[PDB]
Design a protein around this ligand. Structure first.
Ligand code: HEM
Ligand code: HEM
Ligand SMILES: C[C@H](O)[C@H](O)[C@H]1CNc2nc(N)[nH]c(=O)c2N1
Ligand SMILES: C[C@H](O)[C@H](O)[C@H]1CNc2nc(N)[nH]c(=O)c2N1
Ligand SMILES: CNCC#Cc1cc(C)cc(N)n1
Ligand SMILES: CNCC#Cc1cc(C)cc(N)n1
Ligand SMILES: [Zn+2]
Lengths: 412, 412
């Protein structure tokens, strides 16, 4: 019940007790493990006070006033307000705590050593999509900080009945457009083709190129969403060059500096924040491995092998591997020379081992998803490959949610 | 109950029903996933006939005589023999079926497309360690086949009381010695230092070098084990050279061509074969990534970076990654030019996707351990990264077992 995890590179063993406080279900059973399944699987008052109480007991245990009068009266207060409204409202201090701990609990995030340095932007007074555009722009400008990136989250009003939802329809605040072609191939980013089409359906006029930043599709209070274009001066981009290969520029590649996930759901004390865009800084491999070399993404291993002069007829020449390293040396090199914050997969995985140590020490554990923590290249030469990890679901949490254009009781 | 697994590169979905026949427990619960834990965790007659019956019902269902008289009388026969002896003996046909399906069921093995082409060597008449040495030598010579490697397993007598166990004490039939140093560092293979010491404790005279093949430590019928040296003409080795870098030879590296795991336990119909050495052929990354570049193994990334002239002061120069690719191009190149069978991680992972397809088609599923199937470099540019997999325990199976020098009621 009080399980051990080993590192098979350093022989370090650590004991996990945190998993006892785990609440939600993982998808695994005693007879089947779903640890590699990507997405395994309205609320009433009777369900809502337990979740409220559990969250408040840990918040007040955190500020070292567990059981004081201020705790007891807040308990009473929220119970009464859930009696009164069949929902409730978080204190500002509770929102910041809940948001910081949703990140802390995010078992798929290798970056969590930073979890206590999160800037929280309270957007619960927002009422319109223009208001959301304005809040989001302020978030982008703050988090970018001239390339000295800063972690931030903006939190729009919580779900009420369920038909009044605030939603950012984009999967990230800043993504490149995806257009198919007459010849069937694809320009830009194939991941976003169905989303790019929706933007044009709502009247986006597309500069049908490669690295065309997409417009925001913001839905406020369950209303049909509206398009807004981020001031291009606010979208910071890094041109990608190699520190040896001068033909690299002719590839004409760039990426955006701000990774900002906008499609997930923030759960705190039982309340559900359906729009909660959050940003940090990139680990290089997200760009250089997945974005650039996934077969169903930009898929550029072809032309980097070509302009490197490689044995491309033989699978066993490892020409794919060798081009993959050069691409990631360049992504890193270009961000660094521009003073735009980026972390390499060696530094980031070392920090997560160090973070894990602190979590077992002063928290009794750290939920971690090995399938997602291990980088998507050079896995075993980073220390997280050799680190056993336990995955379990703690709350506050970030959860997946359906794409809104499948939920929306649209009125057009 | 009848679960689906998706490939997020090709959008292919396949339905798993095989997991229903799963029997053993995984280590996961509804509230915690142990999919990254390496080793999660005598027999009576009452337990033994169910296992015997379950195995026989699938064997006879396999040869398309489910429920015939030959099935019914074999059922009766084995029941009577477990009444008589409180154990039983497999038919030759049943041993070959059981061994081929233990491999088929091995969820951590990416090579299983070959599972039906296994040569089974029945060594259940063996009574002495010399006999084991002789059986093992015949296995090594057959499986090597002049570099045209052939899959094989040799099966020594099954466990009886438990104090009469046949055991190969080495973890692989062919491993390099591991000696520490006065200055604390290590020559050879640090993985094997405690085993190499045991060999010297039993009187092995060590050529204290790097690539010194270790002697066999064979235990027969629960007796104290004995040392035997494999005729060096039978240990095929590949000298590792690079197809571009001529300084590669000066590194003076070689590896053995035959991967042959000797420390696991083969379970069939409830019977336990504690010595069952089995061999195939290498996937390059086992040598070039893990054996050579694991920090606690040969750990040669240092000198390959050095003789490549690389930016070794900066973690973010990806000098480790870039040296790692060249090492694996060389491992492959050297094996191929010597006509010694080897598979690259791209070909082997493609074949396992194809194998998975056949298993869902004609078997209803394929148990697979993602954490182990994904190669330890370049993970996401191989198709198994993007393939969801279900892990569950089917029998016949290969299981881990304690190291014998911790179990053995030694009489010296
Ligand atoms: C500060 C620097 C950060 C770094 C270096 C980092 C690193 C990463 C990486 C590499 C991933 C994997 C993404 C993928 O493979 O698609 C990830 C996922 C994730 N991160 Fe972090 N992150 C950072 C900040 C944050 C912040 C500020 C939050 C929330 C407030 C967060 C929460 C998450 C979540 C929930 C996921 C999973 C998203 C998904 O399932 O697609 N991270 N992070
Ligand atoms: C024919 C070519 C084969 C290839 C290319 C292959 C490939 C692999 C690889 C890469 C591993 C991972 C080893 C590690 O990372 O330590 C593995 C493990 C394994 N293989 Fe296969 N294999 C082959 C044949 C076989 C055979 C003949 C058997 C049994 C009869 C087998 C059963 C297993 C088992 C049980 C494991 C897990 C061992 C462990 O947990 O350390 N394989 N295989
Ligand atoms: C902690 C982790 O489970 C451990 O390092 C595993 C990960 N995956 C692996 N996969 C393979 N094929 N071989 C290994 O030794 C390991 N090691
Ligand atoms: C099938 C598999 O779960 C899927 O491809 C996962 C594997 N691990 C991952 N890990 C990260 N960080 N990001 C991903 O998109 C994925 N994809
Ligand atoms: C599909 N998830 C995409 C992503 C992402 C991500 C998000 C954050 C906050 C940081 C980071 N380094 N990456
Ligand atoms: C720790 N397991 C080591 C191993 C191994 C192995 C075994 C077989 C049969 C084939 C292969 N390609 N590799
Ligand atoms: Zn699991």
């Amino acid at each position: 019940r009080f399980l051990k995890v080993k590192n098979w590179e350093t022989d370090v063993v650590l004991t996990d007790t945190l998993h006892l406080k785990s609440t939600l279900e993982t998808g695994c059973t005693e007879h089947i493990c779903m640890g590699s399944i990507m997405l395994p699987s309205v609320a009433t008052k009777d369900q809502l006070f337990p979740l409220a109480k559990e969250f408040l007991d840990q918040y007040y245990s955190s500020i070292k006033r567990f059981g004081s009068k201020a705790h007891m009266d807040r308990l009473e207060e929220v119970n009464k307000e859930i009696e009164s409204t069949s929902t409730y409202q978080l204190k500002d201090t509770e929102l910041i705590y809940g948001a910081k701990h949703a990140w802390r609990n995010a078992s798929r995030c290798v970056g969590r050593i930073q979890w206590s340095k999160l800037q929280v932007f309270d957007a619960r007074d927002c009422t319109t999509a223009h208001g959301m555009f304005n809040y989001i722009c302020n978030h982008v400008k703050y988090a970018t900080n001239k390339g000295n990136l800063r972690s931030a989250i903006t939190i729009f009003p919580q779900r009420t009945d369920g038909k009044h939802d605030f939603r950012v329809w984009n999967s990230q605040l800043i993504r490149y457009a995806g257009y198919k072609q007459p010849d069937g191939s694809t320009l830009g980013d194939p991941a976003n083709v169905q989303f790019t089409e929706i933007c044009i359906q709502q009247g986006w006029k597309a500069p049908r190129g490669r690295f065309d930043v997409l417009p925001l599709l913001l839905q406020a209070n369950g209303n049909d969403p509206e398009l807004f274009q981020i001031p291009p001066e606010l979208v910071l981009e890094v041109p990608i060059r190699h520190p040896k290969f001068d033909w690299f520029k002719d590839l004409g590649l760039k990426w955006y500096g701000l990774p900002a996930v906008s499609n997930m759901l923030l759960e705190i004390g039982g309340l559900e924040f359906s729009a909660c865009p959050f940003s940090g800084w990139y680990m290089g491999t997200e760009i250089g491995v997945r974005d650039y070399c996934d077969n169903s993404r930009y898929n550029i291993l072809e032309e980097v092998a070509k302009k490197m002069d490689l044995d491309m007829r033989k699978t066993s020449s490892l020409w794919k591997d060798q081009a993959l390293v050069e691409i990631n040396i360049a992504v890193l090199y270009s961000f660094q020379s521009d003073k735009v914050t980026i972390v390499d997969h060696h530094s980031a995985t070392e920090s997560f081992i160090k973070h894990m140590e602190n979590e077992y020490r002063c928290r009794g554990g750290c939920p971690a998803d090995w399938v997602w923590i291990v980088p998507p290249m050079s896995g075993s030469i980073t220390p997280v490959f050799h680190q056993e990890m336990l995955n379990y679901r703690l709350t506050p949490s970030f959860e997946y949610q359906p794409d809104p254009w499948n939920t929306h009781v649209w009125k057009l």
